[PDB]
Protein backbone atom coordinates (compact mmCIF):
# COMPACT_ATOMS: atom_id res chain seq x y z
CA UNK A 1 0.00 0.00 0.00
CA UNK A 2 0.82 3.72 -0.18
CA UNK A 3 -0.58 6.85 1.49
CA UNK A 4 -2.18 9.54 -0.67
CA UNK A 5 -4.58 12.45 -0.20
CA UNK A 6 -7.99 12.83 -1.88
CA UNK A 7 -9.87 16.11 -2.39
CA UNK A 8 -12.54 17.88 -4.41
CA UNK A 9 -11.12 21.41 -3.91
CA UNK A 10 -7.33 21.06 -3.30
CA UNK A 11 -7.87 22.71 0.10
CA UNK A 12 -9.49 20.16 2.38
CA UNK A 13 -7.37 17.02 2.02
CA UNK A 14 -8.66 13.67 3.32
CA UNK A 15 -5.91 11.10 4.04
CA UNK A 16 -6.02 7.69 2.35
CA UNK A 17 -3.99 4.49 2.04
CA UNK A 18 -4.44 2.67 -1.27
CA UNK A 19 -3.70 -1.00 -1.80
CA UNK A 20 -1.16 -1.05 -4.67
CA UNK A 21 -2.93 -4.10 -6.12
CA UNK A 22 -6.28 -2.37 -6.73
CA UNK A 23 -6.87 0.42 -9.23
CA UNK A 24 -7.77 3.84 -7.82
CA UNK A 25 -11.23 3.49 -9.36
CA UNK A 26 -11.85 0.29 -7.45
CA UNK A 27 -11.02 2.18 -4.25
CA UNK A 28 -12.12 5.83 -4.63
CA UNK A 29 -14.21 5.93 -7.80
CA UNK A 30 -13.17 8.22 -10.66
CA UNK A 31 -9.80 9.71 -9.66
CA UNK A 32 -7.54 12.30 -11.28
CA UNK A 33 -3.97 13.62 -11.03
CA UNK A 34 -3.20 17.01 -12.57
CA UNK A 35 -6.22 16.63 -14.83
CA UNK A 36 -5.37 13.09 -15.94
CA UNK A 37 -7.82 10.20 -15.40
CA UNK A 38 -6.07 7.59 -13.22
CA UNK A 39 -9.27 5.60 -12.51
CA UNK A 40 -7.93 2.54 -14.40
CA UNK A 41 -4.34 2.72 -13.05
CA UNK A 42 -3.09 1.02 -9.89
CA UNK A 43 -1.12 2.92 -7.23
CA UNK A 44 2.51 3.62 -8.15
CA UNK A 45 5.37 4.39 -5.78
CA UNK A 46 6.06 7.97 -6.92
CA UNK A 47 2.36 8.68 -6.23
CA UNK A 48 3.12 8.49 -2.51
CA UNK A 49 1.87 11.57 -0.67
CA UNK A 50 0.43 13.22 -3.79
CA UNK A 51 -3.04 14.75 -3.88
CA UNK A 52 -5.79 13.23 -6.02
CA UNK A 53 -9.04 14.84 -7.12
CA UNK A 54 -12.02 12.50 -6.66
CA UNK A 55 -15.71 12.87 -7.38
CA UNK A 56 -18.01 13.83 -4.51
CA UNK A 57 -19.35 10.48 -3.32
CA UNK A 58 -20.27 11.38 0.32
CA UNK A 59 -22.05 14.39 1.73
CA UNK A 60 -19.00 16.03 3.29
CA UNK A 61 -17.41 16.25 -0.17
CA UNK A 62 -20.63 17.33 -1.90
CA UNK A 63 -20.74 20.32 0.49
CA UNK A 64 -17.03 21.11 0.08
CA UNK A 65 -17.62 20.99 -3.71
CA UNK A 66 -20.57 23.36 -3.55
CA UNK A 67 -18.60 25.74 -1.29
CA UNK A 68 -15.65 25.95 -3.74
CA UNK A 69 -17.43 25.62 -7.11
CA UNK A 70 -21.08 26.50 -6.42
CA UNK A 71 -22.11 23.42 -8.22
CA UNK A 72 -24.07 20.33 -7.47
CA UNK A 73 -23.42 18.89 -10.92
CA UNK A 74 -21.71 15.50 -10.46
CA UNK A 75 -20.26 15.79 -13.98
CA UNK A 76 -18.63 19.14 -13.20
CA UNK A 77 -15.33 17.85 -11.86
CA UNK A 78 -14.69 15.44 -14.72
CA UNK A 79 -15.44 18.20 -17.25
CA UNK A 80 -12.93 20.42 -15.40
CA UNK A 81 -10.26 17.72 -15.38
CA UNK A 82 -10.80 16.85 -19.07
CA UNK A 83 -10.16 20.51 -19.96
CA UNK A 84 -7.24 20.93 -17.59
CA UNK A 85 -5.44 18.01 -19.20
CA UNK A 86 -5.20 20.31 -22.24
CA UNK A 87 -5.05 23.80 -20.68
CA UNK A 88 -2.09 22.86 -18.47
CA UNK A 89 -0.12 22.25 -21.70
CA UNK A 90 -1.04 25.61 -23.27
CA UNK A 91 1.45 28.50 -23.09
CA UNK A 92 0.38 31.74 -21.37
CA UNK A 93 2.77 34.47 -22.56
CA UNK A 94 2.67 37.99 -21.20
CA UNK A 95 1.71 40.32 -24.05
CA UNK A 96 1.56 44.05 -23.44
CA UNK A 97 1.31 43.46 -19.71
CA UNK A 98 -1.57 40.98 -20.11
CA UNK A 99 -1.77 37.22 -19.76
CA UNK A 100 -2.67 35.87 -23.22
CA UNK A 101 -2.71 32.31 -24.68
CA UNK A 102 -0.66 30.87 -27.49
CA UNK A 103 -2.99 29.37 -30.10
CA UNK A 104 -4.05 25.74 -29.50
CA UNK A 105 -7.19 23.63 -29.55
CA UNK A 106 -9.20 26.39 -31.25
CA UNK A 107 -8.69 28.65 -28.23
CA UNK A 108 -8.66 32.12 -29.91
CA UNK A 109 -12.04 32.91 -28.33
CA UNK A 110 -10.75 32.02 -24.84
CA UNK A 111 -7.63 34.13 -25.29
CA UNK A 112 -9.82 37.11 -26.30
CA UNK A 113 -12.08 36.52 -23.31
CA UNK A 114 -9.12 36.11 -20.95
CA UNK A 115 -7.62 39.42 -22.11
CA UNK A 116 -10.97 41.17 -21.71
CA UNK A 117 -11.45 39.91 -18.16
CA UNK A 118 -8.13 41.41 -17.17
CA UNK A 119 -9.31 44.85 -18.24
CA UNK A 120 -12.75 44.99 -16.60
CA UNK A 121 -13.92 44.91 -13.01
CA UNK A 122 -15.41 41.59 -12.05
CA UNK A 123 -15.79 39.47 -8.94
CA UNK A 124 -16.65 35.83 -9.51
CA UNK A 125 -18.94 34.20 -6.96
CA UNK A 126 -17.47 30.68 -6.86
CA UNK A 127 -14.20 30.77 -4.89
CA UNK A 128 -12.62 28.30 -7.25
CA UNK A 129 -13.20 30.71 -10.12
CA UNK A 130 -12.14 33.84 -8.20
CA UNK A 131 -8.94 32.12 -7.01
CA UNK A 132 -8.12 30.90 -10.51
CA UNK A 133 -8.80 34.39 -11.90
CA UNK A 134 -6.25 35.85 -9.48
CA UNK A 135 -3.71 33.17 -10.36
CA UNK A 136 -4.32 33.90 -14.05
CA UNK A 137 -3.69 37.65 -13.73
CA UNK A 138 -0.32 36.58 -12.29
CA UNK A 139 0.43 34.48 -15.39
CA UNK A 140 -0.77 30.97 -14.38
CA UNK A 141 -4.08 30.64 -16.19
CA UNK A 142 -4.47 26.89 -16.88
CA UNK A 143 -7.00 26.32 -14.11
CA UNK A 144 -8.90 29.45 -14.97
CA UNK A 145 -9.19 28.43 -18.61
CA UNK A 146 -10.28 24.94 -17.61
CA UNK A 147 -12.88 26.36 -15.24
CA UNK A 148 -14.21 28.68 -17.93
CA UNK A 149 -14.75 25.68 -20.21
CA UNK A 150 -16.44 23.65 -17.49
CA UNK A 151 -18.69 26.54 -16.38
CA UNK A 152 -19.69 27.34 -20.00
CA UNK A 153 -20.38 23.62 -20.72
CA UNK A 154 -17.78 23.71 -23.49
CA UNK A 155 -15.01 21.24 -24.32
CA UNK A 156 -11.52 21.85 -25.59
CA UNK A 157 -11.44 22.27 -29.35
CA UNK A 158 -15.12 23.28 -29.64
CA UNK A 159 -15.80 26.55 -31.43
CA UNK A 160 -16.75 29.36 -29.07
CA UNK A 161 -18.42 32.74 -29.32
CA UNK A 162 -16.75 35.35 -27.08
CA UNK A 163 -20.00 37.14 -26.31
CA UNK A 164 -21.71 33.86 -25.36
CA UNK A 165 -18.78 32.97 -23.11
CA UNK A 166 -18.68 36.35 -21.34
CA UNK A 167 -22.43 36.10 -20.81
CA UNK A 168 -22.10 32.72 -19.14
CA UNK A 169 -19.18 34.01 -17.08
CA UNK A 170 -21.12 37.12 -16.02
CA UNK A 171 -23.90 34.88 -14.69
CA UNK A 172 -21.35 33.49 -12.26
CA UNK A 173 -20.14 36.95 -11.20
CA UNK A 174 -21.46 39.54 -8.79
CA UNK A 175 -23.37 41.85 -11.08
CA UNK A 176 -26.53 41.75 -8.93
CA UNK A 177 -25.93 45.34 -7.80
CA UNK A 178 -25.94 46.40 -11.49
CA UNK A 179 -28.87 48.28 -12.97
CA UNK A 180 -30.00 49.61 -16.32
CA UNK A 181 -32.98 51.84 -17.02
CA UNK A 182 -34.34 52.01 -20.54
CA UNK A 183 -37.10 54.09 -21.98
CA UNK A 184 -38.98 53.05 -25.13
CA UNK A 185 -41.14 55.47 -27.11
CA UNK A 186 -43.60 54.11 -29.65
CA UNK A 187 -45.88 56.56 -31.42
CA UNK A 188 -48.81 54.23 -30.95
CA UNK A 189 -48.40 52.64 -27.42
CA UNK A 190 -46.57 55.65 -25.96
CA UNK A 191 -43.59 55.90 -23.65
CA UNK A 192 -42.59 53.09 -21.30
CA UNK A 193 -39.69 52.56 -18.87
CA UNK A 194 -37.98 49.32 -18.05
CA UNK A 195 -35.40 48.39 -15.46
CA UNK A 196 -32.85 45.63 -15.94
CA UNK A 197 -30.53 44.13 -13.35
CA UNK A 198 -27.77 41.55 -13.36
CA UNK A 199 -26.18 40.32 -16.57
CA UNK A 200 -28.91 41.87 -18.69
CA UNK A 201 -27.95 45.29 -17.36
CA UNK A 202 -24.48 45.12 -18.88
CA UNK A 203 -24.89 43.53 -22.28
CA UNK A 204 -26.59 44.69 -25.41
CA UNK A 205 -26.80 43.06 -28.81
CA UNK A 206 -27.54 45.36 -31.71
CA UNK A 207 -24.94 48.07 -31.81
CA UNK A 208 -21.29 48.43 -30.94
CA UNK A 209 -21.63 52.07 -29.99
CA UNK A 210 -22.39 53.05 -26.38
CA UNK A 211 -23.00 56.58 -27.54
CA UNK A 212 -25.62 55.40 -29.99
CA UNK A 213 -27.40 53.48 -27.30
CA UNK A 214 -27.52 56.64 -25.22
CA UNK A 215 -28.82 58.63 -28.16
CA UNK A 216 -31.32 55.92 -29.07
CA UNK A 217 -31.73 52.87 -31.30
CA UNK A 218 -34.64 51.78 -33.46
CA UNK A 219 -36.42 48.67 -32.25
CA UNK A 220 -39.76 47.05 -32.92
CA UNK A 221 -42.64 47.66 -30.56
CA UNK A 222 -45.46 45.33 -29.76
CA UNK A 223 -47.65 47.53 -31.97
CA UNK A 224 -45.96 46.16 -35.05
CA UNK A 225 -44.23 49.52 -35.33
CA UNK A 226 -40.71 50.78 -34.79
CA UNK A 227 -40.19 52.45 -31.41
CA UNK A 228 -36.99 54.03 -30.07
CA UNK A 229 -35.10 52.61 -27.07
CA UNK A 230 -32.53 54.73 -25.26
CA UNK A 231 -30.48 54.44 -22.09
CA UNK A 232 -31.82 56.44 -19.16
CA UNK A 233 -29.51 55.26 -16.36
CA UNK A 234 -26.54 52.90 -16.08
CA UNK A 235 -25.05 51.58 -12.86
CA UNK A 236 -22.21 49.13 -13.54
CA UNK A 237 -18.38 49.08 -13.74
CA UNK A 238 -18.44 48.33 -17.50
CA UNK A 239 -20.82 47.71 -20.36
CA UNK A 240 -20.47 45.24 -23.25
CA UNK A 241 -21.87 46.27 -26.65
CA UNK A 242 -22.19 43.61 -29.35
CA UNK A 243 -23.33 43.23 -32.94
CA UNK A 244 -22.71 40.83 -35.80
CA UNK A 245 -19.24 41.29 -37.24
CA UNK A 246 -18.92 44.40 -39.37
CA UNK A 247 -16.30 46.97 -40.30
CA UNK A 248 -15.88 49.50 -37.52
CA UNK A 249 -13.60 52.37 -36.62
CA UNK A 250 -11.86 52.17 -33.24
CA UNK A 251 -10.15 55.25 -31.79
CA UNK A 252 -7.72 55.06 -28.84
CA UNK A 253 -9.12 56.46 -25.60
CA UNK A 254 -12.82 55.97 -26.45
CA UNK A 255 -13.24 52.30 -25.43
CA UNK A 256 -11.37 49.76 -23.28
CA UNK A 257 -11.05 46.71 -25.57
CA UNK A 258 -12.85 44.96 -28.42
CA UNK A 259 -13.28 41.55 -30.08
CA UNK A 260 -12.14 41.49 -33.71
CA UNK A 261 -13.60 38.58 -35.69
CA UNK A 262 -12.57 37.51 -39.18
CA UNK A 263 -14.04 34.69 -41.32
CA UNK A 264 -17.27 32.70 -41.53
CA UNK A 265 -19.84 32.17 -38.81
CA UNK A 266 -18.54 29.87 -36.04
CA UNK A 267 -15.20 28.86 -37.63
CA UNK A 268 -13.48 32.26 -37.98
CA UNK A 269 -10.68 33.72 -35.87
CA UNK A 270 -10.91 36.12 -32.93
CA UNK A 271 -8.26 38.71 -32.08
CA UNK A 272 -8.19 41.24 -29.23
CA UNK A 273 -8.00 45.02 -29.66
CA UNK A 274 -7.06 47.00 -26.57
CA UNK A 275 -6.82 50.78 -26.15
CA UNK A 276 -3.62 51.80 -24.32
CA UNK A 277 -1.24 54.67 -25.27
CA UNK A 278 -2.03 53.35 -28.75
CA UNK A 279 -4.17 50.53 -30.19
CA UNK A 280 -2.72 47.06 -29.70
CA UNK A 281 -3.93 43.96 -31.51
CA UNK A 282 -3.20 40.82 -29.47
CA UNK A 283 -3.51 37.55 -31.37
CA UNK A 284 -2.65 34.85 -28.88
CA UNK A 285 1.14 35.23 -28.63
CA UNK A 286 1.39 37.77 -31.46
CA UNK A 287 1.26 41.52 -30.90
CA UNK A 288 0.85 44.35 -33.40
CA UNK A 289 0.09 48.04 -32.88
CA UNK A 290 -1.45 50.87 -34.88
CA UNK A 291 -2.35 54.52 -34.35
CA UNK A 292 -5.73 53.98 -36.01
CA UNK A 293 -7.97 51.02 -36.61
CA UNK A 294 -10.69 49.97 -39.02
CA UNK A 295 -11.73 46.35 -38.95
CA UNK A 296 -14.39 43.73 -38.28
CA UNK A 297 -15.54 44.15 -34.67
CA UNK A 298 -18.28 42.22 -32.88
CA UNK A 299 -17.97 43.30 -29.21
CA UNK A 300 -16.78 46.53 -27.57
CA UNK A 301 -16.18 47.00 -23.83
CA UNK A 302 -16.45 50.38 -22.17
CA UNK A 303 -15.74 51.49 -18.59
CA UNK A 304 -18.69 52.80 -16.58
CA UNK A 305 -19.60 53.73 -13.06
CA UNK A 306 -22.75 55.85 -13.03
CA UNK A 307 -24.49 57.46 -15.99
CA UNK A 308 -27.78 59.38 -16.00
CA UNK A 309 -29.34 60.74 -19.16
CA UNK A 310 -30.26 64.27 -20.21
CA UNK A 311 -33.61 63.01 -21.69
C1 LIG B 1 -17.51 32.04 -33.43
C2 LIG B 1 -18.82 31.35 -33.03
C3 LIG B 1 -18.83 30.17 -32.30
C4 LIG B 1 -20.10 29.65 -31.99
C5 LIG B 1 -21.29 30.26 -32.43
N6 LIG B 1 -22.57 29.65 -32.09
C7 LIG B 1 -22.96 28.78 -30.95
C8 LIG B 1 -24.21 29.63 -30.87
N9 LIG B 1 -25.27 29.23 -30.41
C10 LIG B 1 -24.96 28.76 -29.11
C11 LIG B 1 -26.12 28.61 -28.12
C12 LIG B 1 -27.35 29.36 -28.56
C13 LIG B 1 -28.18 28.31 -29.38
O14 LIG B 1 -28.12 29.68 -27.44
C15 LIG B 1 -27.07 30.53 -29.37
C16 LIG B 1 -26.34 30.17 -30.60
C17 LIG B 1 -24.03 29.97 -32.33
C18 LIG B 1 -21.28 31.44 -33.17
C19 LIG B 1 -20.02 31.96 -33.46
C20 LIG B 1 -19.83 33.26 -34.29
O21 LIG B 1 -19.36 33.21 -35.40
N22 LIG B 1 -20.19 34.52 -33.66
C23 LIG B 1 -19.90 35.75 -34.41
C24 LIG B 1 -20.78 35.95 -35.65
C25 LIG B 1 -20.22 35.93 -36.99
C26 LIG B 1 -21.00 36.16 -38.15
C27 LIG B 1 -22.37 36.42 -37.97
C28 LIG B 1 -22.89 36.44 -36.64
C29 LIG B 1 -24.28 36.75 -36.61
C30 LIG B 1 -24.98 36.81 -35.37
C31 LIG B 1 -24.27 36.57 -34.16
C32 LIG B 1 -22.84 36.30 -34.20
C33 LIG B 1 -22.18 36.24 -35.49
C34 LIG B 1 -24.65 36.92 -38.06
O35 LIG B 1 -25.72 37.17 -38.41
N36 LIG B 1 -23.53 36.71 -38.87
C37 LIG B 1 -23.49 36.82 -40.31
C38 LIG B 1 -19.70 36.87 -33.35
C39 LIG B 1 -18.48 36.26 -34.05
CL1 LIG C 1 -24.95 29.07 -6.97
CL1 LIG D 1 -22.19 31.17 -9.24
CL1 LIG E 1 -16.89 25.90 -43.67
ZN1 LIG F 1 -23.19 47.69 -9.42
ZN1 LIG G 1 -46.23 50.49 -29.02
ZN1 LIG H 1 -6.06 42.92 -35.89
Residues of the chain within CATH 3.10.20.540 domain(s) are 2-54
User: How far is it, in rounded angstroms, from Cα 304 to Cα 214?
Assistant: 13
- Burial classification of residue 258, based on how many CB atoms lie within 10 Å of its CB (0-12 exposed, 13-18 middle, 19 or more buried): buried
Calculate how far, in angstroms, residue 71's C-alpha sits from the geometric centre of ligand 5: 24
| Segments of the chain assigned to CATH 2.60.120.1680 | 179-308
Helix (H, G, I), strand (E, B) or coil at 215: helix
Name the segment(s) of the chain with CATH classification 1.10.8.1190.
Answer: 84-170
Which residues does residue 233 pair with via DSSP β-bridges, in sequence order?
181, 308
Number of residues that make up the chain? 311
* Ligand 1 atom 8 nearest Cα: 161
By what technique were these coordinates determined?
X-ray
Sheet holding 31-33, edge to edge: 14-18, 2-7, 51-54, 31-33, 36-37
> 68 CB contacts (<8 Å, ≥6 apart)?
8, 9, 11, 126, 127, 128
In sequence order, the 6+-apart residues with CB closer than 8 A to the CB of 210 are 239, 241, 300, 302
Neighbour count for residue 293 (Cβ, 10 Å): 20
Distant-in-sequence, close-in-space partners of 158: CB < 8 Å, separation ≥ 6: 106
CB neighbours of residue 23 within 10 Å: 16
- Give CA–CA dist 272/261, Å, rounded: 9
Distances (CA, A) of 140 to 114, 229, 275: 12, 43, 24
d(CA 53, CA 57): 12
Q: How far apart are CA 26 and CA 199, in angstroms?
A: 43
269 Cα–ligand 4 center, Å? 13
Ranges of beta strands (E only) in 22-78 are 31-33, 36-37, 51-54
Radius of gyration of the chain (CA): 23
Look up the CATH architecture of domain 179-308: Sandwich (2.60)
How many Å lie between the centroid of ligand 4 and the Cα of residue 151? 27
Bridging pattern class, strands 257-262 and 238-250 = unpaired
Closest ligand by atom to 268 CA: 1
> 228 near 212, Cβ under 8 Å?
no
DSSP, collapsed to helix, strand or coil, labels residue 183 as strand
Superfamily for the 2-54 domain? Papain-like viral protease, N-terminal domain (3.10.20.540)
Instruction: Say if CB 302 and CB 292 are below 8 A apart.
Output: no
Atom in ligand 1 nearest the alpha carbon of residue 160: 3
Cα-to-chain-centroid distance, residue 283: 17
Q: Who's near 94: CB < 8 A, 6+ residues apart?
A: 100, 139
CB-based contacts of 144, cutoff 8 Å, min separation 6: 114, 129, 132, 133, 135, 136
Pairing of strands 238-250, 203-205: parallel
**84-170 topology per CATH:** Helicase, Ruva Protein; domain 3 (1.10.8)
Residues near ion ligand 7 (CB < 5 Å) are 271, 281
Atom of ligand 1 nearest to the CA of 242: 38
Amino acid sequence: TIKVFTTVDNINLHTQVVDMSMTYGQQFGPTYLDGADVTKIKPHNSHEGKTFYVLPNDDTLRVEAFEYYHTTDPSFLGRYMSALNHTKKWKYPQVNGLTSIKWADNNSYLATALLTLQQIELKFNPPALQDAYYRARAGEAANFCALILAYCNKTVGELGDVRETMSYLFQHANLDSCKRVLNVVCKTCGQQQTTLKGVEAVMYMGTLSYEQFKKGVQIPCTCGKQATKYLVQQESPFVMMSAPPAQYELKHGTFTCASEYTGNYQCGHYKHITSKETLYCIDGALLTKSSEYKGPITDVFYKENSYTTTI
